[PDB]
Amino acid sequence: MELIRIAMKKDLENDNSLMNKWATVAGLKNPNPLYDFLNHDGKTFNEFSSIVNIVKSQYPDREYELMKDYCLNLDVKTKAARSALEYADANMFFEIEDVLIDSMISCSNMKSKEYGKVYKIHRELSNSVITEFEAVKRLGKLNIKTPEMNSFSRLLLLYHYLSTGNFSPMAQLIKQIDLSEISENMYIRNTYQTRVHVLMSNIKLNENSLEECREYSKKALESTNILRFQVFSYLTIGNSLLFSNYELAQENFLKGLSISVQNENYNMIFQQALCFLNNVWRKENKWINFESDSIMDLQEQAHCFINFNENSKAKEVLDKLDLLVHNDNELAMHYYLKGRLEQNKACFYSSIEYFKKSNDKFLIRLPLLELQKMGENQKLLELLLLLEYA
Amino acid sequence: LIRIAMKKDLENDNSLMNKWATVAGLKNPNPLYDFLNHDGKTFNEFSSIVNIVKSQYPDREYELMKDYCLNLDVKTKAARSALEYADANMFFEIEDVLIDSMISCSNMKSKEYGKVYKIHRELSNSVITEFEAVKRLGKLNIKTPEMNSFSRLLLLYHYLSTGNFSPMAQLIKQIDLSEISENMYIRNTYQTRVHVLMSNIKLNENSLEECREYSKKALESTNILRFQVFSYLTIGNSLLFSNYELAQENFLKGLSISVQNENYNMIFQQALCFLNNVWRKENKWINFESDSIMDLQEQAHCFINFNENSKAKEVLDKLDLLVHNDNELAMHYYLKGRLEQNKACFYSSIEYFKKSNDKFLIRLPLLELQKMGENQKLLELLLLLEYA
C-alpha cells in the first residue's frame, strides 16, 4: 500500500467525518470513487486534481513525500501517470519527473510515450543538453498527436526564450497556444493555464506594460495551488514595482520568501530580487551574495559598489565580470554598470543596443535614465525609445 | 498616317525593306508587306513597329503612333502592348483613351489590362487611396501574369512617389517576369522597369554600386526616353555624396536627352540644384519663382550654405505654412537643424528619414550630428536601429 492510503485510512479509524470532507475537497460528489481508491490497489481517481487537493487539504507538510510515493507507484500507461508527469514538472520535482519520464519513453502507451518524449526534450533544453535547434527538430520529428503536447511543445520553447533573454519571439508564440482544445485531462489544462498566465505576466513585464503584468500574475495566483507558480507570481508582481514603489516591491518579495522557507532555490530567487531592488534604489544592500561567481551576483556586487562610490572595488568586480560570457540581456546590464563606473555615454548606448536586441523595454529604463541625467537631448531619447532592432 | 509615310518612303528607295525587316527583327519582309498592304493587320510583337519608327521617323514618333495606336482594335494583343508603350512613355493622352475604351470592350484579357492600368493612373493622380487601389485590384481577382506583374509594379510606383520605401524590396522580389510568355514586349519593357525600380530601391538602401549597376542595365535594355531619363537621374543621385563631377555629368547627359520635354528638363534642373547645395557650391539652378516644397527647400539650403539666415528664415517660414510627406519633413528638419544649429532638429530629421526607410538622405543629418561632436557609438546605434 502507498503511504498516502495508509495515512488516510489510519486517519479514518480515528475520525469518520473525513470521508465527506475528503469527497468535497476532491470535488467527488459522492465518496464512491474514494471508497474505490482506498480499498482496491491501482484504482485511480478520474482527475488528478482530487488526490492532489486531498494531500494539500490533509497532509500539506508531507506533500512531497506522499506523492513521491504515490506517483512513482502508478501505472505509467494511465491518465493519472500523465497527470503525475505534469504535476512533477510544475513543482520542479525533477526526481519524480525524470523517473516518470524515462519510464514513459519506454512504456506501451503511445499517449504516455509522447508526453514522455516532449517533457524529455523540455528537460534537456532546460539543462543546456540540447540546442534550441535540436529541441525543435526533435519535436517536429515526434509528430505530436495530443492537444496537450502541442500546447506544451510551445510552452517549453517559451521557457527557453525567457531564460535566455530572447523576449521578442514570445508574444507571437504564446498567442498560438489554445488550451480550450484540451478535453481529456483537466489537470493538465488547469495547470497549463496557470503556466500561461505566469508567462503572459512575464511578457507584459518585459514590454513595460506593468498594470497588465500585475493583473496577469494575479490571475495566475487565483488560478493555482502550486507553490512554484505562486513564487514566480509574487516575484513578477514585485519586479513590476521595481521602479515605482520600493515598499510594495519589497513586500511582494518578502511574501514570496515567507511561503518558500523550505526551499533553497526559491529562497535565493527572492534574495536576488531584493538585492536588485536595493541596488536600483541605491540603498544599503544586505542581500549581496559575495561568495558567488554567477553574473547576476557579481553584477549586483558591482552595482552596489558603484552606488557607494567604491570604484576600485567596482572595477575589480567588473574585471572579473569581463572574463565571463554573457547573454544579450546580461551584456546590456554589464554595459550599464560600465557606464556608471566610467561615466561614459557610449557604454549606455551599448547597453541600449543589447536591451534592444533582447527586446527588454523594462530594464532599458536604467541606461535611459542615466543618459538623461547626463543632459542628453530629449528628442534623441524619444527616438531611442521608439526605434527597434531587426 | 503611319503607313502613308512608309510607302511614301518606299516609293523613293526600296532598300528600306531589308533594313525595316532587320530593325523590327522580322527575319524576312513578309509581315511588313503584310502590315503595309492590309489595313488593321498587326505584327506579332509590338516591338517591331516601335523599333521601325525609331529608325526612320525619330522626328515624329509621338504623333504618328498617337495615330497608329488610337486606330487599333482594342481587343487585340497589339492594343494591350500599346497600352504599355503608352504607359512606358507617360503618353497619358493615348492610353487614358485606350484605357476607358478597353474596360468597355468584350475581350477578357484586354479587359484586365485596362482596369489595372486605370487603378495605376487613379492611384498616381491621388484619385484613390493606396487602400482602395489595393482592394479594387484584389476585387479583379487578376488572372493574367502580366497584370500580376504590373499590379505590384503600380504599388511600387506608389510607394516610391509617397516616400514609403520599406514595402518595396519585399514587394518587387515577388515579381517573376519568367511567367509572362504571351507578350514579349510587355516583358522586355517590364524588365527595364524592374531594373529601374531595382535601381531606385538600392539607392534608398544606400547600396550605391548595386544602384549604378541596375541603372546601367536599365540603359542597355531600353530605347525608351523616360527610362533613360530616370536611369541617368538615379546614377547621378547615387554619386551625390561622393563624386561631384560624375553626378553633374549624368544629370547633364539626362538634360541633353530631355531638352524638349518640360517635365524631364525640370527634373534634371532640380537634381543639379540639389547637387550644388549638397557640395555647398554656387547654385545657378535655383528656381526663385516657385512655391513647391522641393524648390523652396533648395532656396533655404543655399541661403543657409552662404550664411543668409534671414533669407533662410523667410523661406522656412513659407515652408512651414505648407504640407509635407514624411521624406519632405525629414528634409525640413534637416535644414531647420542647420539654420538653428539645434541637435533636436537633426534627430527629428532622422526620425522621419527612418520612418521612410531612406538610408541615403539620412546621411545629411548624420554628418551634421557628427560635426557637432555627437558620440560615435550613438551615431552607430542611430545608424542601425530601424523604425517599426
Residue numbers in the entry:
A (entry chain A): 1 to 390
B (entry chain B): 3 to 390
What do the study's own words say?
The arbitrium system comprises three phage genes: (1) AimP, encoding the peptide that is processed into a 6 aa signaling peptide extracellularly, (2) AimR, encoding the intracellular receptor of AimP that is predicted to be structurally similar to RRNPP regulators, and (3) AimX, encoding a putative long non-coding DNA that functions as the negative regulator of lysogeny. As a transcription factor, AimR dimer induces expression of AimX, which promotes lytic cycle. The concentration of AimP will eventually reach the point that its uptake by newly infected bacteria will be high enough to bind AimR and abolish transcriptional activation of AimX, thereby shifting the phage into lysogenic cycle. As predicted from its similarity with RRNPP proteins, the structure of AimR is characterized by two domains, i.e., the N-terminal HTH DNA-binding domain (residues 1–73) and the C-terminal TPR domain (residues 79–386), which are connected by a short linker (residues 74–78).
Due to the high flexibility of N-terminus, the electron density of the apo AimR DBD was weak, which made it challenging to build the structure of residues 1–55. After a strenuous effort, the structure of full-length apo AimR was solved at 2.63 Å resolution using single-wavelength anomalous diffraction method. The final structure of apo AimR contained two molecules in the asymmetric unit spanning residues 1–386 and a C-terminal His-tag. The two protomers within the asymmetric unit are nearly identical, with an average root mean square deviation (RMSD) of 0.159 Å. A notable feature of AimR structure is that it comprises a total of 24 helical secondary structures, including 22 α-helices and two 310-helices. While the first five helices form the DNA binding domain, the remaining α-helices are grouped into eight TPR motifs and a C-terminal capping helix. AimR and AimR-AimP are homodimers and the dimerization is mediated by the C-terminal capping helix, with an approximate solvent-accessible surface of 810 Å2. The residues L380, L383, L384 and L386 contribute to dimerization by engaging in van der Waals interactions with matching residues from the other subunit. The first three α helices in N-terminal DNA-binding domain of apo AimR show a high degree of flexibility. To conclude, we would like to propose an amended mechanistic model of arbitrium system in SPbeta phages, which takes into consideration all three relevant studies (Dou et al., 2018; Wang et al., 2018, and the present study): in the absence of AimP hexapeptide GMPRGA, AimR possesses a highly flexible N-terminal DNA-binding domain.
